[PDB]
Amino acid sequence: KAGMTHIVREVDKPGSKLHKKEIVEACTIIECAPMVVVGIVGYRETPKGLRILSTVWANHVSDEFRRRYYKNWYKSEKKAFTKSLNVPEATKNCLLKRIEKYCTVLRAICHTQPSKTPLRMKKAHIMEVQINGGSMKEKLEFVKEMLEKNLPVSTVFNPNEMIDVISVTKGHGTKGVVSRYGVKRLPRKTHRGLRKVACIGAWHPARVQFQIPRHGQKGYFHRTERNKKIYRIGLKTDKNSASTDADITEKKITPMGGFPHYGVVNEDFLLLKGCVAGTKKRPITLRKNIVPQVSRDALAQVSLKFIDTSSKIGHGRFQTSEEKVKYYGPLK
Amino acid sequence: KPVTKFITINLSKLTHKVCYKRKAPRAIKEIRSIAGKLMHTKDVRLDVKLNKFIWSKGVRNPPKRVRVKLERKRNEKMYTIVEHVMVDSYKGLVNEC
Amino acid sequence: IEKKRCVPFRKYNGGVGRTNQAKEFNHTQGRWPAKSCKFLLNILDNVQANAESRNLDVSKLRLIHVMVNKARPGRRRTYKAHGRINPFMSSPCHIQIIAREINKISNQNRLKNKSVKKQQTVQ
RNA sequence: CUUUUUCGUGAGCUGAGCUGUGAGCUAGGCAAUAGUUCUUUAACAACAAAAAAGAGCACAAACUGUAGACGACUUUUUUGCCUCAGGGUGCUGUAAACAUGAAAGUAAACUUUUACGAUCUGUUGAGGCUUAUCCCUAGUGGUAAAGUGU
RNA sequence: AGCGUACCAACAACCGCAUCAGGUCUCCAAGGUUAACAGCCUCUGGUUAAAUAGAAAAAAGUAGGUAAGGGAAGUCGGCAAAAUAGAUCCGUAACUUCGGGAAAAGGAUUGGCUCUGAGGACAUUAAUGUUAACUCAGAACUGAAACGGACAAGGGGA
Ligand SMILES: [Mg+2]
Ligand SMILES: [Mg+2]
Ligand SMILES: [Mg+2]
Ligand SMILES: [Mg+2]
Ligand SMILES: [Mg+2]
Ligand SMILES: [Mg+2]
Ligand SMILES: [Mg+2]
Ligand SMILES: [Mg+2]
Ligand SMILES: [Mg+2]
Ligand SMILES: [Mg+2]
Ligand SMILES: [Mg+2]
Ligand SMILES: [Mg+2]
Ligand SMILES: [Mg+2]
Ligand SMILES: [Mg+2]
Ligand SMILES: [Mg+2]
Ligand SMILES: [Mg+2]
Ligand SMILES: [Mg+2]
Ligand SMILES: [Mg+2]
Ligand SMILES: [Mg+2]
Ligand SMILES: [Mg+2]
């Protein structure tokens, strides 16, 4: 996660009070460098739940993938993944044949590339991505062609699509009932203080119940949110990645002075309508809908008229740095 | 072995959190800690003129920057002396041995 | 004393805090009581000096005995609301240490016949 | 235990085939005894001493603030990081000093000359400040102790 | 002639069970701003000590500060807080024991700088000189319209 900005768009809703007008909306920017596909894993069904057969790895892996297996890499001999990748291919093909024969779910193991971001961390993040589609043989032939390549983001999603978002909310520590749960604040005359709950329960269930709100820890919770729409997929090879047909100033997505508390975004990215849980730099997981939406909003396609790139430090007044020097003329 | 160093320290970075009655002693404590950690010496002595300079504006707002000189002597075999350097501008100064 | 390592509090630990240095002892609570350490160091120095006289090599000494006993307490007062007076005692102790030098069927003729027959039967 | 002999079954031997291993066919010679029963010491799994055949990491430490009452958590330890500086992006609102520049008026030598004067103007969109939880930079100087467990 | 004469007088030497935030009688009394021995700052004299210190800094408390739009809808009840306050110049009702009510209610002004005017004494002649001390009126300029700038200081009415 990088930051937010706003855009200008023309509405196309017959029947609305805003049918033919220009409006302003807020958006969130996610930095989306490509991942790398490094392995395969297959599951089969049992009455005890899904069950792993085996894991097959690719022929070479990178050092930022290996750092995730160490609590301190700087003092180590770094021998992880140094024997197992030297197996003959015959064993791997026999294992893949078994997976084709007995398994019902395939997933692909992929990892991120934090060196292309402004992050201080060097360990990569690892996750499993399920592969839906045809028969198991077709799935297997699909995955193997990718086993040591890059996934760009536009291979996975499309413009104007609807997405779900998974992440962890911002932390706040220990908070009281008034803030944690939103209870009615108590009169000024109260003797031991007023920020509490007056009655914890009736006499006689002679215990406190688990539905009574108390003090405790607030924030840093795990959440899944539905139906966030995609407005644009940018590309790092594109000079005018924040310009429209109505505004031909040649611009990038990063505002004057850098995204505050993040840095400069110089890979390809996503622009999402709305907001997303987490701080700056927080990793965001993206998923397709459980079943596809067919409503009018999820099918409508968006044309943008203005992306804003003025400074978010203070109250910015220019769209580029050249405007600023042109306005004042020569200084001292 | 002995060595001499010239550095500048900005104190508003270090006193930003404390209240009015603690702004100058916090700066003094930070100077001592920084010098000791940069010289690897547990024994750090502060010259009285530097202490006088730090308190020149009262307890409430010490100066925003200070330039000091650090020398390590042979006397717990070694120790560090910290003195004050008077400058009329901090603009170009970086640190040197 | 220098807070490089801690002492795990396993017995009298009501309200003692949690610390990062207790994981070394597979525990969660610890503290750094300096006065106790100084008092114990004085006695260990005395033990070593007494071992120098009777010509033992210090490198092989092992503390085989450590015993702490509580002594008669001293007495002071403290004052409380509504004109009351309450005790303000202390808690002294005894200590003793020892170090030591370390290196590194019945015949029963009837029973004999039974045993012989048993051993014969298994072959 | 000898003798005469058959068939399966595989180590070394390529359904040649000796022999290992089991099951039989002839003809014979040779044992068991503790004085009337006291659980018929009989299974399964371990361990120890000898003889032969086989041979790495985590904690701590200094940083970090996406975390926080303390523990815990997220990070880095040489293209990294800390530091100071340069640059960017913002906040305030035009610094100190000079000017025989202005200024309602005043008094004091003989058209000017000297004196006092709130405030105003020029050099001046100037001066100051900006991460401690802002952004960029193989820019400067650094990057310490050898402890604990397994 | 005889008797008293050291020291504390509370800040730990007195009474309160104590080296207790309580109680306990007299005299002296500087500068600035002001009506002021008030409040705030200072010179002489006194001190920098209190049954503890370091770091961190979230709930909750206690002593404080601010808050868009509304303005008592809160509560038994405007409890708590807010609003007003000094001087000068104007203007003040019902009722009344004619003395009051009354600061009734209400309205305007207030800095800095440069000027003008008015209030005494003395000694030689309607003239001439020598000299003070604080008040009170008026005018022109000046500033991000501010000026009892902090301190101090009535809410009113039926
Ligand atoms: Mg009450
Ligand atoms: Mg902002
Ligand atoms: Mg520029
Ligand atoms: Mg008490
Ligand atoms: Mg009492
Ligand atoms: Mg017998
Ligand atoms: Mg000036
Ligand atoms: Mg930093
Ligand atoms: Mg006397
Ligand atoms: Mg006397
Ligand atoms: Mg008594
Ligand atoms: Mg007292
Ligand atoms: Mg006291
Ligand atoms: Mg508070
Ligand atoms: Mg305010
Ligand atoms: Mg309000
Ligand atoms: Mg009401
Ligand atoms: Mg009500
Ligand atoms: Mg009241
Ligand atoms: Mg009245």
PDB file of C-alpha atoms (C1' of nucleotides) in Angstrom, chain B residues 5 8 10 12-13 16-17 37 40 64-65 90-91 93-95 97, chain D residues 62-63 83-86 129-133 139-144:
ATOM      1  CA  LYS B   5      37.043  14.008  15.675  1.00  0.00           C
ATOM      2  CA  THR B   8      27.921  18.555  14.675  1.00  0.00           C
ATOM      3  CA  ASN B  10      21.326  18.818  16.198  1.00  0.00           C
ATOM      4  CA  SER B  12      15.901  19.536  18.409  1.00  0.00           C
ATOM      5  CA  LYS B  13      15.910  16.027  16.966  1.00  0.00           C
ATOM      6  CA  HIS B  16      11.483  16.893  20.719  1.00  0.00           C
ATOM      7  CA  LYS B  17       9.529  14.697  23.157  1.00  0.00           C
ATOM      8  CA  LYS B  37      28.979   5.424  21.889  1.00  0.00           C
ATOM      9  CA  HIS B  40      33.790   3.191  22.589  1.00  0.00           C
ATOM     10  CA  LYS B  64      19.093  23.676  17.878  1.00  0.00           C
ATOM     11  CA  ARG B  65      22.624  22.658  16.826  1.00  0.00           C
ATOM     12  CA  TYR B  90      26.558  25.610  10.392  1.00  0.00           C
ATOM     13  CA  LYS B  91      25.746  25.491   6.678  1.00  0.00           C
ATOM     14  CA  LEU B  93      29.989  21.588   7.977  1.00  0.00           C
ATOM     15  CA  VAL B  94      30.256  17.814   7.720  1.00  0.00           C
ATOM     16  CA  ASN B  95      32.217  15.641  10.142  1.00  0.00           C
ATOM     17  CA  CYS B  97      38.691  12.966  11.696  1.00  0.00           C
TER      18      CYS B  97
ATOM     19  C1'   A D  62      23.519  -2.674  18.406  1.00  0.00           C
ATOM     20  C1'   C D  63      19.417  -0.707  14.707  1.00  0.00           C
ATOM     21  C1'   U D  83      24.925  10.107  11.083  1.00  0.00           C
ATOM     22  C1'   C D  84      25.567  14.973   9.150  1.00  0.00           C
ATOM     23  C1'   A D  85      25.201  17.679   4.607  1.00  0.00           C
ATOM     24  C1'   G D  86      23.272  18.884  -0.433  1.00  0.00           C
ATOM     25  C1'   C D 129      12.324  26.224  10.067  1.00  0.00           C
ATOM     26  C1'   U D 130      11.139  21.383   7.831  1.00  0.00           C
ATOM     27  C1'   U D 131      11.398  13.681  11.053  1.00  0.00           C
ATOM     28  C1'   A D 132      12.389  12.961  15.904  1.00  0.00           C
ATOM     29  C1'   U D 133       6.981   7.984  12.669  1.00  0.00           C
ATOM     30  C1'   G D 139      27.910  12.359  -0.979  1.00  0.00           C
ATOM     31  C1'   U D 140      31.060  12.717   4.579  1.00  0.00           C
ATOM     32  C1'   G D 141      32.502   9.867   8.963  1.00  0.00           C
ATOM     33  C1'   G D 142      31.431   5.273  11.252  1.00  0.00           C
ATOM     34  C1'   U D 143      29.685   0.087  11.742  1.00  0.00           C
ATOM     35  C1'   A D 144      31.302  -1.753  18.740  1.00  0.00           C
TER      36        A D 144
END
